[PDB]
């Protein structure tokens, strides 16, 4: 009535590791919480994890001679009775620095509704289809990332060669300015052949740098465009990973062993 079974409660998730519960409370609203069996794996601990202030808190539920509570006054009888008391009353009584109460419980029943096809006939076949899609997409993304890294090296190499061509022009232009000063003594009265060659070499180099500038521009666009495809593929890889692991998590409790998964993967 006021104390139900923990097994049928929605916030109580049973036995999950710390890394498996950080994802559940990741980027969530402040005040969300869930109760799990303690990592130390005794009986009756039921550590409570709470998301307050942008980080995940942990609270241990002490238990002595059939009672439960946070501090040493073990007034509350059952775990369900204790939590339901702090959903309607803020934790400020327990600690002044703890303000936000247990507002939004993380529930496992809604995630059960998320899964289609509770019958075993479709769970096995759907998992293979999702894994094939996930493996194909993962291979596609690894190919794009390798290509994207390659184009990063080319534009970096091409950009430096652009800097060298800018400096070579500067040296040649500086050398030409010396000729303008030095040719005064002769124009007032060979040199003509020498000057034509210098102008010819600079003009060709100007074209060579300009062709490098155009080539970098084309390479830069491809570097950007493929970075658009890579950024678009990733969200689809995110959704497929969640559903594939969801089916595996649902299927792994039917009596199979981890060695089967290791060989399959």
């Amino acid at each position: 009535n006021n104390n139900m079974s923990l097994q049928d409660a929605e916030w109580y998730w049973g036995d999950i590791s710390r890394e498996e519960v950080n994802e559940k409370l990741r980027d969530t609203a402040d005040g969300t919480f869930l109760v799990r069996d303690a990592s130390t794996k005794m009986h009756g601990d039921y550590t409570l994890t709470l998301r307050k202030g942008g980080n995940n808190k942990l609270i241990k539920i002490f238990h002595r001679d059939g009672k439960y509570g946070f501090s040493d006054p073990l007034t509350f009888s059952s775990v369900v009775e204790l939590i339901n008391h702090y959903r309607n009353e803020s934790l400020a009584q327990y600690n002044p620095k703890l303000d936000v109460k247990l507002l939004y419980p993380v529930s496992k029943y809604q995630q059960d509704q998320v899964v289609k096809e509770d019958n075993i006939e479709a769970v096995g076949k759907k998992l293979h289809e999702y894994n094939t899609q996930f493996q194909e997409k993962s291979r596609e993304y690894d190919r794009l990332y390798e290509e994207y890294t390659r184009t990063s090296q080319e534009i970096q190499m091409k950009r430096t060669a652009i800097e060298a061509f800018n400096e070579t022009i500067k040296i040649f232009e500086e050398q030409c300015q010396t000729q303008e000063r030095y040719s005064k003594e002769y124009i007032e009265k060979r040199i003509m052949h020498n000057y034509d060659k210098l102008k010819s070499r600079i003009s060709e180099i100007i074209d060579s740098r300009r062709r490098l500038e155009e080539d970098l521009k084309k390479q830069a666009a491809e570097y950007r465009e493929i970075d658009k495809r890579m950024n678009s593929i990733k969200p689809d890889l995110i959704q497929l990973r969640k559903t594939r692991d969801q089916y595996l998590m649902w299927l792994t409790q039917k009596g199979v062993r981890q060695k089967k998964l290791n060989e399959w993967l």
Partner: protein, 971 residues
């Protein structure tokens, strides 16, 4: 790139008078040779009367990396010029002759020109280059203060242990406290090798060893030396302390020592020249008086690189992160269409301005949300950034700031990247964010010591809680910390000083969102008792970003961490050099003192920093670090330029062998490398240089009779180098090395470091599990050097060179005699070591080709570069190994020999689990390194699972017994 960016090479020289002359010169011709002939050729032009003296002219041209370098070094050939375009300008020399020569050695050793570091005008970099010369001068003075002996200590440092006390099991291998040794005195210029045999104690110093040797020959000017390599015994330590002697006794072999006169060694050592560089010559109110709240305005994003159709709306997700933990809730700007990223919104945070700790470190991001399908909208990050809220001079940031956003790293799912390095993307093809900070009509300065100290002490011997305090301090750093413990720790912080190991746990109990408790904690950290060096390295992690905590940790390291421990933990200490936020930290001023005092540490300090310059996040930070080290390294710059040049001809040799010859078969590739390595360009470079894997080993004339492309996975190179040492037949006849190009050696290098640590734990405790951690070294991007372990065979190959009895019969074949009963023993004590180690670390699958066995029965793996991935047991004793362990008996599982193999594995697993804190610390420093399988604290949670750290000691063993029984199918 080294030669040019040809059978006939024409350079278009540009004389000062402007005579553009195109003439042909040989590649082998040096700069001086072409200079002399060009002036003679230029005299034919009509404007030759204006030529000045030849000596007052020099060459200036363009390098490959666009650096306009001046060619004062006339010795360099045309190939070494690294010219960009074929041309040559002649101008009178300017500046200092010696400084620019040094600038070219440093530029080549680093891999980037030194002139690029003087372009940046940022105060953070400029005052780092100028102020890092206090340590560089201090270190140089120290190593030159004493006699010429102090010069030798830098060049040939001792390779010693951390403890003179021998382990009990090792000490029983030598009888009555005496060990025998042979000395190889050379008495004549003609090679007359004679050996003296003498009995020495395990406590005698090399001075006493020299005294006994002179007596046996029948004030001292002689020093010892390891025959076969460049290791010397010129430190007043017990002879049993040295690593070479410990290896010789524990492997049970003959130590061979040679006599070298001191004067012969001192003449080899040259002088040092530390020229002081050019750049060496060249209304505020407290933060706590502000009562406003942190407000930051995100003006706009110039560029964003995601598709308009696929991604609907984007937003900017921020937050104030004190080194991983959020100081307040993350704030989202309102979503905007992807076409026009423009927010112009004053983001408000919960942090009171005086509440801000020193390492506030605001973190940004740019996520993309679609919302078309799925109850949970998929936020896919597009970029990230980090901004320190306090400048290096204790000043809160103010005014408009422009930041360039990095791309999200591969395999990262979090919207923010609090682990990323604070800074801006140097590239100009990345998203750019415009920020604006609140301006308080004056410069805001973080409070000094006096203001923080006066905040403390202004606001205001047990019964049983000591047991709880002891229990808290003995848990893992990643263990379950609860809100009741944090309250308990902070309430009893004054009695936590009596347990100094509890500091890393107590810092987790402090709330940096309030300045009242932060000020009170600074009082305790000021007078904390010093802790062990293996526990003070914990405070250097990412979770502890405060200047005082990281400053305190280094203060323990400077007094406690030794030279041999530093060499072991050099990979990690370099990795925690990016978690620092300011360039002028205390770790750099501590790391550089050691790197300018030991050439052995300096050799690996250079290569560890040089390998991480491929990443653009720490290219500038580590570039300034190596430039200051290379300048003050000394005469090692000539040796470190031999290895870099030698390892660059190999990269070019392999690179064209990988891409241009991928379709080609091994037969043509074998004949292709024969021609390419035949050229004199490779012969000069790949000869007579110190090996990167070990500064003691010298690589002689590269032996071409056995130097072929390994027919393995990524076409590696198997290279043979003779031993140029006079007494080489005692240690090495040819130093084989595998040059792996295209494979990540960072995961393998870390694996062998843990294996080295594990073997030290077992041997010290009392076990005698013997394993082979070979040499590995990553040099650059996906390029590494692997040391060959001499005589060895894969077990896959051993079954064709000799059925489950093949492995045992082969061992019994080449073990005839009484030594056969010891070959199986070594096959057992090494099998047990690699079963516990592989299970704990979760290394990848172990075929019969990754398993290597020596002629003496020792076993070792070719450690895969995929750890913590394959819960999983990689190595299971197959039917081949179980026969050898059980002495060939068909009743393998029930024999006494297999029973002793199980109790050998249980004692090994329990020993490592007792020292599990050390392995957790080592794995937690390589988070920012970039290994795909180690990038967040949930990856180290695998180690805490296979070690069964949550459960008790007796519950852990039954986790190990069951885990091995799932494959062994029997105890």
């Amino acid at each position: 790139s080294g030669e040019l960016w040809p059978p006939r090479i024409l350079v278009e020289c540009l004389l000062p008078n402007g005579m553009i002359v195109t003439l042909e010169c040989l590649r082998e011709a040096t700069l001086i040779t072409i200079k002399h002939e060009l002036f003679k050729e230029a005299r034919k032009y009509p404007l030759h009367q204006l030529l000045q003296d030849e000596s007052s002219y020099i060459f200036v041209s363009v390098t490959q990396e666009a650096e306009r370098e001046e060619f004062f070094d006339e010795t360099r050939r045309l190939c070494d010029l690294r010219l960009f375009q074929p041309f040559l300008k002649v101008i009178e020399p300017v500046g200092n002759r010696e400084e620019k020569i040094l600038n070219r050695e440093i530029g080549f050793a680093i891999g980037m020109p030194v002139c690029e570091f003087d372009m940046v005008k940022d105060p953070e970099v400029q005052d780092f280059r100028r102020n890092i010369l206090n340590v560089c001068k201090e270190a140089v003075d120290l190593r030159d203060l004493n006699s010429p002996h102090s010069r030798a200590m830098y060049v040939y440092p001792p390779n010693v242990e951390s403890s003179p006390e021998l382990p009990k099991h090792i000490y029983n291998k030598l009888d009555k406290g005496q060990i025998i040794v042979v000395i190889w005195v050379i008495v004549s210029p003609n090679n007359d090798k004679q050996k003296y045999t003498l009995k020495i104690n395990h406590d005698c110093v090399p001075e006493q060893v020299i005294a006994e040797a002179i007596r046996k020959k029948t004030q001292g000017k002689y020093i010892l030396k390891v025959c076969g390599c460049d290791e010397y015994f010129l430190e007043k330590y017990p002879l049993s302390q040295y690593k070479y002697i410990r290896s010789c006794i524990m492997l049970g072999r003959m130590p061979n020592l040679m006599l070298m006169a001191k004067e012969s060694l001192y003449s080899q050592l040259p002088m040092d020249c530390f020229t002081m560089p050019s750049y060496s010559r060249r209304s505020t109110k407290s933060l706590w008086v502000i009562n406003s709240a942190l407000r930051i305005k995100i003006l706009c994003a110039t560029y964003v690189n995601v598709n308009i159709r696929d991604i609907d709306k984007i937003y900017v997700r921020t937050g104030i992160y004190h080194g991983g933990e959020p100081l307040c809730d993350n704030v989202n700007t309102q979503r905007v269409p992807c076409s026009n990223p423009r927010w112009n919104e004053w983001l408000n945070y919960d942090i009171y301005i005086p509440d801000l700790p020193r390492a506030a470190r605001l973190c940004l991001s740019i996520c993309s949300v679609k919302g078309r399908k799925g109850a949970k909208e998929e936020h896919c990050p597009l970029a990230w950034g980090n901004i320190n809220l306090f400048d290096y001079t204790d000043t809160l940031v103010s005014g408009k700031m422009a930041l360039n956003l990095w791309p999200v790293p591969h395999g990262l799912e979090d919207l923010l990247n609090p682990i990323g390095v604070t800074g801006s993307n140097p590239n100009k093809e990345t998203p750019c964010l415009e920020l604006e900070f609140d301006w308080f009509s004056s410069v805001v300065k973080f409070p000094d010591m006096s203001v923080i100290e006066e905040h403390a002490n202004w606001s205001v011997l047990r019964e049983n809680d000591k047991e709880q305090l002891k229990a808290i301090s003995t848990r893992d750093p990643l263990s379950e910390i609860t809100e009741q413990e944090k309250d308990f720790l902070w309430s009893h912080r004054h009695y936590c000083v009596t347990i100094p190991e509890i500091l890393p746990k107590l810092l987790l109990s402090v709330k940096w969102n309030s300045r009242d408790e932060v000020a009170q904690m600074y009082c305790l950290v000021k007078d904390w008792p010093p802790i062990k060096p293996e526990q003070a390295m914990e405070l250097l992690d990412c979770n502890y970003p405060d200047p005082m905590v990281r400053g305190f940790a280094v203060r323990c390291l400077e007094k406690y961490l030794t030279d041999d421990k530093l060499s072991q933990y050099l990979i990690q200490l370099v990795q925690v050099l990016k978690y620092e936020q300011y360039l002028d930290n205390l770790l750099v001023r501590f790391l550089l003192k050691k790197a300018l005092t030991n050439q052995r540490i300096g050799h690996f300090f250079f290569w560890h920093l040089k390998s991480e310059m491929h990443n653009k996040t720490v290219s500038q930070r580590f570039g300034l670090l190596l430039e200051s080290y290379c300048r003050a390294c000394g005469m090692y710059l000539k040796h470190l330029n031999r290895q870099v040049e030698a390892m660059e001809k190999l990269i070019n040799l392999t690179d064209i062998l990988k891409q241009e010859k991928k379709d080609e078969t091994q037969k043509v590739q074998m004949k292709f490398l024969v021609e390419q390595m035949r050229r004199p360009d490779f012969m000069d470079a790949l000869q007579g240089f110190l090996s990167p894997l070990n500064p003691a080993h010298q690589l002689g004339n590269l032996r071409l009779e056995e130097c072929r492309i390994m027919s393995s996975a990524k076409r590696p190179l198997w290279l043979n180098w003779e031993n140029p040492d006079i007494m080489s037949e005692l240690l090495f006849q040819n130093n084989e090395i595998i040059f792996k190009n295209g494979d990540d050696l960072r995961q393998d290098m870390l694996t062998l470091q843990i294996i080295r640590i594990m073997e030290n734990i077992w041997q010290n405790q009392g076990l005698d599990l013997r394993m082979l951690p070979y040499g590995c070294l990553s040099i650059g991007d996906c390029v590494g050097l692997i040391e060959v372990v001499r005589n060895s065979h894969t077990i896959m190959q051993i079954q064709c060179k000799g059925n489950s009895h093949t492995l045992h019969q082969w061992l019994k074949d080449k073990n005839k005699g009484e030594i056969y009963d010891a070959a199986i023993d070594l096959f057992t004590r090494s099998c047990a070591g690699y079963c516990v180690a592989t299970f704990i670390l979760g290394i990848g699958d172990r075929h019969n080709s990754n398993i290597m066995v020596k002629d003496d029965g020792q076993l070792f793996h070719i450690d895969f570069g995929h750890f913590l991935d394959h819960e999983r047991v990689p190595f299971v004793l197959t039917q081949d190994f179980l026969i050898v362990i059980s002495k060939g008996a068909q009743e393998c599982t029930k024999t006494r020999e297999f029973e002793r193999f199980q109790e050998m594995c249980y004692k090994a697993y329990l020993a490592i689990r007792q020292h599990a804190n050390l392995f957790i610390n080592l794995f937690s420093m390589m988070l920012g390194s970039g290994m795909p399988e180690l990038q967040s604290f949930d990856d180290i949670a695998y180690i805490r699972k296979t070690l069964a750290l949550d459960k008790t000691e007796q519950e852990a063993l039954e986790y190990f017994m069951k885990q091995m029984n799932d494959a062994h199918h029997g105890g």
